[PDB]
Amino acid sequence: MQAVRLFQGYMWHPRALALDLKALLPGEVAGARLLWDEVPPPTPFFEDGTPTHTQRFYQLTLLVLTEEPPEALKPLAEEAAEALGEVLEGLPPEVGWLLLEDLRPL
Amino acid sequence: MQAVRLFQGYMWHPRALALDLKALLPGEVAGARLLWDEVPPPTPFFEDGTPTHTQRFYQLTLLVLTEEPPEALKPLAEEAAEALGEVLEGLPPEVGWLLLEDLRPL
């Protein structure tokens, strides 16, 4: 059983807002450990042209255990993405977020 | 000195194309450890409508050992992202990629 870290997307909130993510988020999604780590903003601006430095960003990762090759995880990845989306919809409106499925190349 | 895994983006190449990444990719970038891990296609189709199931995908990550706040690692992220771009442009032309700099504003 190898542990595969699958990037899920990003979530963020105003840096002046001291949210307790450990109390707001579940420890797991689709049987996999949900991890989040504070990181520098992935891009300098939001879609509306405002700077990303005003927010604290977190990288979302699902730690998936599998006995099969990592490249065969799509079924679980899709299920986890849907479930994580539902989880994030339950967070306060002050929390912004965008999952892998909604990221776009310029 | 703790480590933070900074997701940098994706790299991919035809499954039919053999590539020894360990011999082509540098051990580090900007002094930071560069990691590559195979994962399922992050999306079913490329922008040009062609299928992604014909390619092998890898998550690119930078393992950063530091103590300072994440919102201070921006400089490293900058040169790392720049160096990583240079590295990828050095690989065979069949190799494709999408880094954080290629993302549209969130």
> Closest Cα to residue B92, out of B30, B9, B34, B21?
B21
Please identify which residue in the block is written with the tokens 């549209």: B104
Residues 6+ apart with CB under 8 A from B48: none
Cβ distance A105 to B39 less than 8 Å, yes or no, reads no
Inter-residue contact B88 to B11 (CB < 8 Å): yes
Closest CA to A56 of A34, A38, A43: A38
- If contacts are CB pairs under 8 Å, which of residues 25-64 in chain A contact chain B? 37-40, 42-43, 45-49, 52-53, 56-57, 59, 61
User: What is the rounded CA–CA span in Å between residue A9 and residue B78?
Assistant: 20
Technique used to solve these coordinates: X-ray
Q: A87 with A29: CB under 8 angstroms?
A: yes
Q: Is A90 exposed, middle or buried (0-12, 13-18, 19+ CB in 10 A)?
A: exposed
Measured distance CA(B34)–CA(B80) in Å, rounded: 9
| CA-derived radius of gyration, chain A | 14
Question: Strand, helix or coil at B20?
Answer: coil
d(CA B105, CA B103): 6
A93 — phi, psi (to 5°)? Answer: -60, -15
Domain count, chain B: 1
> Rounded to 5 degrees, what angle do the CA atoms A104, A86, B99 make?
20
CATH at residue A47 = 3.30.70.2290
What angle (nearest 5°) sits at the alpha carbon of residue B21, between those of residues B3 and B76?
35
Element (H, E) at B6: strand B3-14
Q: CA of B106 to nearest chain A CA: how many angstroms apart? A: 5
Q: β-pairing, A2-14 with A96-99? A: antiparallel
Sign (positive/negative) of CA torsion B95, B73, A7, A101? negative
Q: Which of A2, A18, A14, A22 is nearest to A73 (CA)?
A: A2
What contacts B101, CB < 8 A, 6 or more positions away?
A43, B81, B85
Instruction: Please give the residue range of the domain that contains residue A60.
Output: 1-106
Q: How far is B57 from chain A (nearest CA, A)?
A: 8
What resolution does the deposited structure have, in angstroms? 1.8
Residues on chain A touching B4 (C-beta within 8 angstroms): 37, 39
Q: List CB contacts (< 8 A) between B15 and chain A.
A: none
Q: Which strand (E) or helix (H) includes residue A4?
A: strand A2-14
CB A65 within 8 A of CB A42: no
CA distance A88 to A26: 10
